[PDB]
Amino acid sequence: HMCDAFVGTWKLVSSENFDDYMKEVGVGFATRKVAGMAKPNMIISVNGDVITIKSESTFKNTEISFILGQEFDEVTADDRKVKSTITLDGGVLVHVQKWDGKSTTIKRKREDDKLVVECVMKGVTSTRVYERA
Ligand SMILES: Cc1c(Cc2ccccc2)nc(C(C)(C)C)c(-c2nnn[nH]2)c1-c1ccccc1
């Protein structure tokens, strides 16, 4: 219901430093190059306490469905198996992924008519902006 403001279909309109963020995370060259090209839609829906986030692109389609604060297993777009927890803190969806002893955090926030996705690995940050389809 505050989560309401995220629901919808959001198309990528800009990206900054995503290749460097992916490098830091450990994504391989072929997947960086092809994923980097893509123009994914991020589709967010809610049904009760279950939130679903889908990403659809020419590269890969991904889907997670989860309850806030309850850890789950995820397969990332670059085919890594991680343990994820998503919480809603001060209005921002905060997605933490843990794998192989590492961690990254992906934040989704509403800013004006945009959905802004900030990805952080160590000190490398990427910002991706999406707008309503
Ligand atoms: C490859 C990839 C990664 C890699 C990665 C995953 C997990 C942690 C760190 C890196 N990450 C993302 C996030 C969630 C982080 C932005 C996307 C992505 N962009 N739009 N929707 N999904 C894609 C992606 C998916 C389809 C098409 C293009 C890009």
* Experimental structure resolution, Å: 1.2
- CA of residue 38 to ligand 1 center, whole Å: 10
Spatial neighbors of 110 by CB under 8 A, at least 6 apart, are 5, 6, 91, 116
**Cα–Cα dist 86/70, whole Å:** 7
- CA of residue 77 to ligand 1 center, whole Å: 6
Are the C-beta atoms of 82 and 93 separated by less than 8 Å? no
- The residue assigned the tokens 């990528």 is 12
**Cα–Cα dist 75/111, whole Å:** 28
Sheet containing 92-99: order of strands: 62-66, 50-56, 41-47, 8-16, 124-132, 114-121, 102-111, 92-99, 81-89, 72-75
**Cα–Cα dist 41/44, whole Å:** 10
Are the C-beta atoms of 22 and 35 separated by less than 8 Å? yes
What are the sequence ranges of the domains in the chain? 3-130
Of 132, 133, 131, nearest to 13 by C-alpha is 131
Are the C-beta atoms of 17 and 127 separated by less than 8 Å? yes
Closest protein CA for atom 7 of ligand 1: 76
Tokens read off for 72: 């789950």
Q: How was this structure determined?
A: X-ray
Of 109, 107, 108, 86, nearest to 98 by C-alpha is 86
Spatial neighbors of 29 by CB under 8 A, at least 6 apart, are none
Pick the CATH number of 3-130 from 3.40.50.2300, 2.40.128.20, 3.40.30.10, 2.40.40.20: 2.40.128.20
Query: Given ligand 1 and candidates 104, 106, 115, 125, which is best to mutate, with the most ligand atoms within 8 Å of its CB?
Result: 106
Q: Which residues pair with 85 in a beta bridge?
A: 96
C-alpha angle 87/121/115, rounded to 5°? 50
